[PDB]
Design a protein around this nucleic acid. Structure first.
Lengths: 104, 57, 55, 91, 221, 99
RNA sequence: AACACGGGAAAACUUACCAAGACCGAACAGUAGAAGGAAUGACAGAUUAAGAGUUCUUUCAUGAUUUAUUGGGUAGUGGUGCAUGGCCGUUCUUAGUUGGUGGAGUGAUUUGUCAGGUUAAUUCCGGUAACGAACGAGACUGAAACCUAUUAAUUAGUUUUCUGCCUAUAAGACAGAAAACUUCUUAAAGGGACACAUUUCAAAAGAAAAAGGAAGCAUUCAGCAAUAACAGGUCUGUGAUGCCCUUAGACAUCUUGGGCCGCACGCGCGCUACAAUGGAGUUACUAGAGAGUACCGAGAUUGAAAUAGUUAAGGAAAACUCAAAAGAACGUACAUGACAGGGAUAAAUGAUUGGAAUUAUUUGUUUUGAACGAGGAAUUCCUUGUAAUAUCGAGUCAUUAACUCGAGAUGAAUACGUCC
């Protein structure tokens, strides 16, 4: 649906060649977050799916080569980003900001 | 990360009594501390085991 | 009647019909979860009820 | 104060038969037992408290009363129970 | 004649059958908080020293851990049935599911509410505030308490208010160990001049187990 | 088919009760379905700390926690949990709902 | 450390103020009188806003429940926070405080609690008329960052099978069954980082890269948080409370109406804008945390331009309700003009809640089209899923959010500093 992000989601395919996915069929279910966040979740899911599949039904040196190719371009392809929203605190409209102080 | 005197004193006492048991590996020293000592907190045990290995280095 | 007009107003909506359980106050009422214990009174008995001061 | 004398017996005979009857401090509502204003039952009992006949402990806007030895004697004098009416600990 | 239309039922929401899980436990605490305070104002001369509200599936057993059972040693059944009758009138309790037990506590010193009532007695008697707290704090210490503190604020020295804190033993002020070892009670006593606030906090020992954070106690071989 | 659900404010309590029912279910009971852990309910209340309006606007956070566990038996309607009480600990409610 | 603060978004109650009217919420005890009536209630005419028998007339009902009296209590959102308790704020979010013995001093007092280095920290290495301790810091508790290892499977999900329907070049989709399953989900127990380990810097406490890792500022955000103090706020939260004031023509309590919204102006907290990084018309969308019944949250069907109306399932709830919009996509639309940006002010009308809506409770319809062209002197908040932007839930809530407390959505710039 966010068409500008499509080539970002497709970039796991082109990082190693579409032939690494030619004999593979995927079925992804996305049920959280916003819309741009789901784009990064699918990127992780596609990249990990190739890595996990080549570990289980292919030898290791292919998997290590594939994961090495993923890592040398972008690390977050295979590891999740741990950043999460901070809790709101009283006295301010956000995590860190605070209401204006008047003296006179 | 300056360690408190509680960790350092406990690290020293265990070394004096149980020097032969301890080794230069942090992971083996973890379980021996749970054995040769009684602590209710996991984080304290690692801090003691972390200093013990550094001390015996 | 000496008392046929006493307390004749209909208090059914609720600002003078709801009160604190123990304090009997009409301001700062905590009606959530059916507590009905108004402010300055729920804080005293919070630890007795079970609401522990967590985050 | 001015309450129906038929009702006055209802509080007295119920209080004796249980030793204790409570009421709310909300004078805008009626009692759910006797079906009469809480003001009437409240002031029929505080007057009896000055006889040293009960105790007027108040808790959470609910008042509690407990029959005493003088309460048992005074109740017999008014409602005219037989002299064997000294049950105690039951009614 | 009174044209009153409203009524205030003498019910308890714990007796309700169809009640939400969120509302049930909240109503459990509200009843316990009110019941504890109610018999606190009744057993003041008896030292009620805590309540328990355990049940047996369909009947509720209310247990009183009084530290002085003198008034209820035998007491035929007067107070026990009088208190139970009070529970019926206030909360509309059916008789077949309500019963009251009275229990004693051997650790009289380790109960803070009983000790606080001891201080209130001596102060209202006329004993000096220095002699009253000193005597009660001696009893707390040898009973096994790790530490104790009594805070008294009021008009002790005259019209200008003055507060004093009495300290003994070992006490932790910061951390979660103050939620596992503390035992406190707040009482107020009236004189012919004003109100005096009494605050008693007793730091317990390994009886509420947990063995507070700083501790190594390395065994010897 | 029989269904058991235990709810309390203490997590350590229900785990003891869940184990007890499973251990008790060897006899007078065929199988002991694992304790289905319904998501915890948290009851948050945020209140001002001051009896008046003076001072800095500081609030305090309270929260109750409700732990819900679900057990399913086969047994018999007559036998059910039999004693079903075991002097159950205060604040921990057990109810048995068959079909 | 006063001014969207009293959880204070007051139509009646709240209410403490004002105009009226009644009324005892005069316990207890003595006396008068009195069960041959102490007293109380009352239809109708007038008095009264009043369907307060309040009062004038009139006799009709009930019956010591008590009228008048003296001592005395009681009651008050009355005064006093310069009489108090309790609670909170602040000094004060940083690292500080103490007594036991011993040493110095006639003494208030001092040492311990330091030269130097280090740390977020009197945190430690060291030093030493100090030795040995106690509180604070740390340790501790909650949330987040991880477990294809474990235990679990409904009210969570996936897979398979049967029936049914539909389009494809060839896989599947949907409906309605029904059984194993546990990666996701839920939630318990354990595990996992302690800077250990390498390099360098400072014999030590330690410091800075880099790699590994889910996580390496104490990992982040919070909770608790010592000694001493203010005569800081509240006696209008309390049947917590001392003294004082009023106490039957009440400052008690009740009823009706109004005010707390009153406008020549001054200040504070905020919401919406001054547009094209936009407004308007259509289309596909994507969260988390909340809450709910003896009438509470309300599915579905209908009435219709909208508000809202008439019927109406399931749900005490991972089970039913409960649902995103900022942004995105479509067009020879709007083209820089107070213009279609802006939506105040007024108008004529439709309904909701309420006993009651005028001084518009809230809201629909059509029309009305005001300042406002980025804001002077001054001044506030903020270091990463943070600011900022727009929205959702909850508190209050018969009705009413531009307020507060939370939750997710998209995701900047600028330092890694110095005491000006």
């Amino acid at each position: 649906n966010p068409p500008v992000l499509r080539i970002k989601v497709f970039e796991p395919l082109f990082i190693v060649g579409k032939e690494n996915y030619a004999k593979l069929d995927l079925k992804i279910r996305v049920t959280g977050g916003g819309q741009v966040a789901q784009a990064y979740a699918i990127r992780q899911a596609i990249a990990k799916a190739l890595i996990a599949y080549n570990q289980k039904f292919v030898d290791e040196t292919t998997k290590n080569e594939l994961k090495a190719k993923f890592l040398e371009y972008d690390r977050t392809l295979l590891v999740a980003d741990p950043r999460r929203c901070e809790a709101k605190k009283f006295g301010g409209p956000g995590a860190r900001a605070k209401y204006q102080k008047s003296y006179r | 990360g300056v360690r408190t005197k509680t960790v350092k004193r406990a690290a020293r006492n265990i070394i004096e009594k149980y020097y032969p048991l301890l080794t230069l590996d942090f992971h083996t020293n973890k379980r021996v501390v749970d054995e040769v000592a009684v602590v209710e907190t996991k984080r304290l045990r690692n801090k003691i085991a972390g200093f013990i290995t550094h001390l015996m280095r | 009647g000496s008392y046929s007009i006493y307390n004749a107003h209909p208090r059914n909506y609720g600002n003078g019909s709801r009160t604190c359980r123990k304090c009997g106050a009409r301001k700062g009422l905590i009606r959530k979860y059916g507590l009905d214990l108004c402010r300055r009174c729920f804080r005293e008995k919070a630890v007795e009820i079970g609401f522990q001061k967590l985050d | 104060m001015r309450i129906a004398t038929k009702d006055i017996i209802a509080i007295y005979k119920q209080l004796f038969n249980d030793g204790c009857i409570v009421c709310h401090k909300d004078f805008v509502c009626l009692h759910p037992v006797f079906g009469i204003p809480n003001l009437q039952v409240f002031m029929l009992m505080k007057g009896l408290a000055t006889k040293k006949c009960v105790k007027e402990t108040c808790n959470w806007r609910c008042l509690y009363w407990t029959l005493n030895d003088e309460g048992i004697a005074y109740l017999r004098q008014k409602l005219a129970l037989p002299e064997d009416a000294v049950p105690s600990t039951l009614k | 004649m009174f044209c009153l239309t409203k009524t205030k039922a003498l019910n308890v929401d714990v007796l309700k059958t169809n009640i939400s899980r969120k509302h049930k436990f909240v109503a459990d605490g509200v009843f316990y908080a009110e019941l504890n305070e109610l018999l606190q104002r009744e057993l003041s001369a008896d030292g009620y020293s805590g309540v328990e509200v355990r049940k047996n599936g369909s009947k509720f057993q209310i247990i009183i851990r009084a530290t002085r059972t003198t008034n209820i040693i035998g007491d035929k059944g007067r107070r026990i049935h009088e208190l139970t009758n009070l529970l019926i009138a206030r909360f509309g309790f059916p008789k077949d599911k309500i019963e009251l037990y009275v229990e004693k506590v051997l650790a009289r010193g380790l109960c803070p509410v009983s000790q606080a009532e001891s201080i209130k007695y001596k102060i209202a008697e006329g004993l000096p505030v220095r002699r009253a707290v000193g005597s009660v704090m001696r009893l707390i210490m040898d009973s096994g308490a790790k530490g104790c503190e009594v805070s008294i604020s009021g008009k002790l020295r005259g019209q200008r208010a003055q507060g004093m804190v009495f300290k003994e033993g070992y006490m932790i002020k910061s951390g979660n160990a103050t939620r596992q070892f503390y035992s406190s009670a707040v009482r107020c006593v009236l004189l012919r001049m004003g109100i005096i606030g009494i605050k008693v906090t007793i730091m317990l020992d390994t009886d509420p187990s947990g063995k507070n954070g700083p501790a190594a106690r390395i065994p010897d071989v | 088919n029989i269904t058991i659900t235990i709810t309390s404010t203490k997590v350590k309590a229900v785990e003891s009760l869940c184990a007890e029912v499973k251990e008790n279910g060897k006899k007078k009971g065929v199988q002991v379905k694992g304790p289905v852990r319904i998501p915890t309910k948290t009851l948050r209340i945020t209140t001002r700390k001051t009896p008046c309006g003076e001072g800095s606007k500081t609030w305090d956070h309270y929260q109750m926690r409700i732990y819900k566990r679900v057990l399913s038996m086969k047994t018999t309607p007559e036998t059910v949990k039999e004693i079903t009480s075991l002097k159950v600990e205060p604040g921990v409610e057990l109810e048995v709902a068959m079909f």
